[PDB]
């Protein structure tokens, strides 16, 4: 809004009763340029500070420990992150567990040995078409159904959709031999 942009141009051409109007338009005009600059920088720094509360969380939990939070430190089951240096930031290397293939196997909620309902302690019951096995949800392994990996609770009259299977007891062939 002033007649010039140079501070020394108005004071050398205009009168000191007349140059004070044009100088005050330059001071108030440049003050709003700094008022817009401090406002735009502090809001963007608040997003950096909100990212600083997030980047310190990743370098304290996922880097310095094993977090059980799904999809918080990358896609998949996170194990350990390797941080790297970066200009005004950080670059992470999240080591995750991602499956590749899958196979459709016959499952069962529980089994019945002599009337009681045997529940799996860790994992679910599977079957390869002939025998009934037990494995976890993340990795398939043909483990033999024993009493140590199962839990006895209730009976087989409450659970709807149950099957029958003989529990392989290791105490039976040891006493007979």
């Amino acid at each position: 809004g002033a007649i010039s942009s140079v501070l020394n141009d108005i004071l050398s051409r205009l009168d000191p009763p007349e140059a004070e109007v044009q100088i005050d338009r330059l001071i108030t005009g440049r003050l709003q340029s700094l008022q817009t600059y401090v406002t735009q920088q502090l809001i963007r720094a608040a997003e950096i500070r909100a990212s600083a509360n997030l980047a310190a969380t990743k370098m304290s939990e996922c880097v310095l420990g094993q977090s059980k939070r799904v999809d918080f430190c990358g896609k998949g089951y996170h194990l350990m992150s390797f941080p790297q240096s970066a200009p005004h930031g950080v670059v992470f290397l999240h080591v995750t567990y991602v499956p590749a293939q899958e196979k459709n196997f016959t499952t069962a909620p529980a089994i019945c040995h002599d009337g009681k309902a045997h529940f799996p302690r860790e994992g679910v019951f599977v079957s390869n078409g002939t025998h009934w096995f037990v494995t976890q949800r993340n990795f398939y392994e043909p483990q033999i159904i024993t009493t140590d990996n199962t839990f006895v609770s209730g009976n087989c009259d409450v659970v709807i959709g149950i099957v029958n299977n003989t529990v392989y007891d290791p105490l039976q062939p040891e006493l007979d031999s």
């Binding site: 999240h94 995750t96 590749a100 899958e102 459709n104 949800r137 398939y140």
Partner: protein, 162 residues
């Protein structure tokens, strides 16, 4: 009617587009405004009818372009207008001139808005299509058959945080 004209009232100045209306003013009132002090409908002083004051064809000039090392074809996107007040395709954000409407939904490469994206594929031209939110897949529900993975792949994802 239906043109960007400059109406000159005795106590009101401004430009706009005059068209038909469904409102009905009072027999003594002559002005009509919006909530935030915006005159959008006035009564004609000659004929006792209601005419709205529609704003003219104003909108931002946006373009859709790929990288400079690939090609040079573009697509003009006139915002907040239809394709009548100006490869013709109408979007919710405005009229898109330059892109071809393809019914095949592909991956959203360059987003436009309102579920519409554009991409430069191969012959080679910018196409307009509804974006695909993912691949077509249906989980087979079964009470006696589950899928447990036998093979794994240790992948290393890169996360960048300021």
């Amino acid at each position: 009617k239906n043109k960007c004209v400059n109406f000159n009232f005795n106590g009101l100045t401004g430009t706009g587009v005059l068209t038909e209306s469904n409102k009905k003013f009072l027999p003594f009132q002559q002005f009509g405004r919006d909530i935030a002090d915006t005159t959008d409908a006035v009564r004609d002083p000659q004929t006792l009818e209601i005419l709205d004051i529609t704003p003219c064809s104003f909108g931002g000039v946006s373009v859709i372009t790929p990288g400079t090392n690939t090609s040079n074809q573009v697509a003009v996107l006139y915002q907040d207008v239809n394709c009548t007040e100006v490869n013709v395709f109408q979007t919710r954000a405005g009229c898109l001139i330059g892109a071809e409407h393809v019914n095949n939904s592909y991956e959203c490469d360059i987003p436009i808005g309102a579920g519409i994206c554009a991409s430069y594929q191969t012959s080679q031209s910018i196409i307009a299509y509804t974006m695909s939110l993912g691949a077509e897949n249906s989980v087979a529900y079964s009470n006696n058959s589950i899928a447990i993975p036998t093979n794994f792949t240790i992948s290393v994802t890169t996360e960048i945080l300021p």
